[PDB]
Structure formats: C-alpha cells, structure tokens
C-alpha cells in the first residue's frame with residue numbers, strides 16, 4: 424500500500440491526500456513534521472534530505488516534493504482525466520501548479536508564520552504587512568483567471584491544478600488578515616464544495 428509520510432494539517436501533505444482520494448488510491452499515512460514526529464532524524468533524512476513532508480513510498484520508489492508527487496500519482500494511477508496527456512492541455516495545468524509553488528506559496532510566508540503559526544521568530548509588523556500585501560497581489564491574479572474561466576483554474580474541467588490552487592485559497596481565507604472581496608474566488612470555492620475530497624482535505628477548517 425502506498426505510504427504517505429506527513430502530518431495531515433500540512434498544506435503540501437493535503438495536496439497529496441486530496442490527489443489520492445480523487446484518483447481512487449488506497450494509502451496509509453504516518454504523522455511526520457513539526458508538532459507530530461520530528462523529521463530531522465537519520466531514518467527520515469535518508470528518504471528526504473530536506474527533512475520535510477510530504478514524502479511517499481510506493482513500493483521501492485521514494486519521492487518527495489508535493490507537486491512532483493501529485494503529478495506522479497496522476498500519471499501512475501489512471502489520472503489522465505485529472506492531468507491530461509495532451510501537451511497544451513497539460514501546460515495549462517502546469518502553469519498554475521508551478522506558479523502556486525514558485526510565487527504564491529512564497530508570498531505568504533511571513534504573514535502565515537506570524538499569524539497562524541504564531542512563530543516567536545516572526546513578530547515584525549512591517550514584514551507581516553509586506554507579506555500580506557504581496558500575497559494579496561498574487562490572489563488578485565487568481566481572481567483574474569477565475570473571472571476568465573468562470574469555472575476551474577485551468578479551464579472548464581476540474582484538473583490537477585485545482586488542488587494546489589484551492590488549498591492555497593483556503594489558506595488565504597483561514598489566515599486572520601483583512602482581505603479584499605474576490606467574488607470569482609468565492610464562487611470557485613463554492614463550486615468545489617460538491618467534491619467530497621475537497622471538503623475532506625481542503626475546506627476543512629485547517630489553514
């Protein structure tokens with residue numbers, strides 16, 4: 424059985440859990456990460472030198488990096504409906520997957536660590552606000568794209584890209600910041616409510 428190493432509250436672990444549920448995979452999950460089981464130990468470092476979650480073990484195959492993992496699962500487990508093989512259709516998904524990780528995630532760092540994790544190391548109000556402002560600019564880009572599609576992030580159909588993106592939106596909505604009205608974003612999160620795995624792993628009260 425596929426093994427998922429990572430605490431269930433982690434946004435990046437939740438990408439993998441949601442993907443597994445969408446595809447129809449059986450899995451066992453072990454708690455790893457801050458607050459759960461420390462990752463900076465030899466047994467875990469041997470699997471992932473970053474000492475971060477998620478990591479998966481699929482038979483003898485070990486893989487880390489959440490967006491790489493969800494791509495792997497969709498490619499391995501009959502996920503062509505979720506992550507299409509056509510290069511242009513796949514690219515429309517990849518743009519948002521990759522931007523989620525390289526830009527959107529990056530933008531929320533200080534505000535999230537300060538306000539949600541209450542990190543004693545992140546108490547500079549100016550940096551909290553800078554992070555909130557930058558995050559807000561990235562959310563306006565998400566709003567623009569959803570205004571255009573009127574549906575899902577990459578087009579008319581739910582796709583792999585909606586998993587990192589909707590989890591990121593959830594983080595925005597659950598962090599205690601003042602937020603501009605983004606109606607296409609709200610309508611999108613309402614649309615997703617019909618998906619059981621979204622309710623289980625995304626909009627579940629955990630930031």
Ligand SMILES: N[C@@H](CCC(=O)N[C@@H](CS)C(=O)NCC(=O)O)C(=O)O
Nearest residue numbers: 433434435456457475476477488489
């Ligand atoms: N880029 C990595 C980031 C992984 C990451 O930052 N994981 C967090 C949890 S969301 C973590 O393991 N922090 C270290 C810890 O909890 O000890 C990915 O997307 O998988």
